[PDB]
């Protein structure tokens, strides 16, 4: 009944090396440790994913290319553009070891849930949901979320994937778009020009998996109250229709106010309410991180959410620790929404929710 916390000092150091989010893993763990939450959890050392484990989703051609460019850090390789390596996903030295580490950590978490040693397994450094079978994408080199679901598949016949990242979890949706045994649900910003450009409400999966992909297109400026209304409405209908045996939850903090992407206007409290709703299902749950580019706020959010999982109220004052100086200007745990408009029209939201309700009527 004690939550599993995927952590090792080696694992955090590796995750710190990602160019797009340097030192974020350290800051998240350091704050969690400063609140002493790790003492209330079962700390589990992550394994490194084998080539074969990664090949359960990713193609050998792609994996071999990753390993190749990882050796010398071969930027400007002729085939790199084809495999998605570029501005978003640079071909840096040791990137293969980075991929295998994160993929292994999520698999380890999934294996803990399978063994029944816990009901909640946490990997805050995972959740890289953009990666395709043969293509890096959106800062993601390996889709650890897919690898984790594939592992959970060995025991749980129906798996629900819930993606609360700011961006559409297109990698995970595409991976399972043709099956009805994994349902993916994504709430995300949807607007022409905004990455990755997919995930309209009309995208519902294909073939046998038709209506087993749920997409909730949302506009800039949404805050806690409306977001939870939308989330609770969709998840209630999804839970009744799909009846999941396990849940994979992606909680990218790039929705949080203060993020440089400045799109959604959320606080960890709002996200926490969505988390609580899923947690009271009492199903095996894999918790992943994802986006989050205000590093202090991302740490604030996932530390708060960890407290939520443990059912603990945390002190409002950030305790002194290695990165205390980064928590200005008020050095508190809570985050204040920005004073900017919510661009979501209630009639648009209502139309979206009705479209989804109609789609889920087919799910039987």
């Amino acid at each position: 009944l004690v939550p599993v916390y995927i952590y090792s000092p080696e694992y955090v150091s590796m995750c710190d090396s990602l160019a797009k989010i340097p030192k974020r893993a350290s800051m998240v763990h350091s704050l969690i440790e400063a609140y002493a939450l790790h003492k209330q959890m079962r700390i589990v050392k992550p394994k490194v994913a084998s080539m074969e484990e990664m090949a359960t989703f990713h193609t050998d051609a792609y994996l071999q290319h990753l390993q190749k460019v990882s050796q010398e850090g071969d930027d400007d390789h002729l085939d790199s553009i084809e495999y998605g390596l570029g501005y978003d996903c640079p071909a840096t030295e040791g990137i293969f070891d980075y991929a295998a580490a994160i993929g292994g950590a999520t698999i380890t978490a999934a294996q803990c849930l399978i063994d029944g040693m816990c009901k909640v397994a946490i990997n805050w450094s995972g959740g890289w949901h953009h990666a395709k079978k043969d293509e890096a994408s959106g800062f993601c080199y390996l889709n650890d979320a897919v690898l984790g679901i594939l592992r959970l598949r060995r025991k749980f016949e129906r798996i629900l994937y819930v993606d609360l990242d700011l961006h559409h979890g297109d990698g995970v949706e595409d991976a399972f778009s043709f099956t009805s045994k994994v349902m993916t649900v994504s709430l995300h910003k949807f607007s022409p020009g905004f990455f990755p450009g997919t995930g309209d409400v009309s995208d519902v999966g294909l073939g046998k998996g038709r209506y087993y992909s749920v997409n909730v297109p949302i506009q800039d400026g949404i805050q806690d109250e409306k977001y939870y209304q939308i989330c609770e409405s969709v998840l209630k209908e999804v839970y009744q229709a799909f009846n999941p045996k396990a849940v994979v939850l992606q909680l990218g903090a790039d929705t949080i106010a203060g993020d440089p992407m400045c799109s959604f206007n959320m606080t960890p409290v709002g996200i926490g309410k969505c988390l609580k709703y899923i947690l009271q299902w009492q199903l095996a749950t894999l918790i992943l991180g994802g986006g989050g580019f205000n590093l202090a706020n991302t740490a604030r959010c996932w530390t708060y959410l960890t407290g939520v999982i443990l059912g603990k109220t945390l002190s409002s004052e950030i305790p002194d620790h290695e990165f205390f100086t980064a928590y200005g200007p008020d050095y508190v745990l809570e985050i204040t929404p920005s004073c900017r408009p919510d661009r979501n029209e209630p009639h648009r939201i209502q139309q979206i929710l009705n479209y989804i309700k109609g789609n889920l009527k087919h799910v039987v």
Partner: peptide, 5 residues
């Protein structure tokens, strides 16, 4: 192909 980022 969009840019993230």
């Amino acid at each position: 192909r969009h840019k993230k980022x």
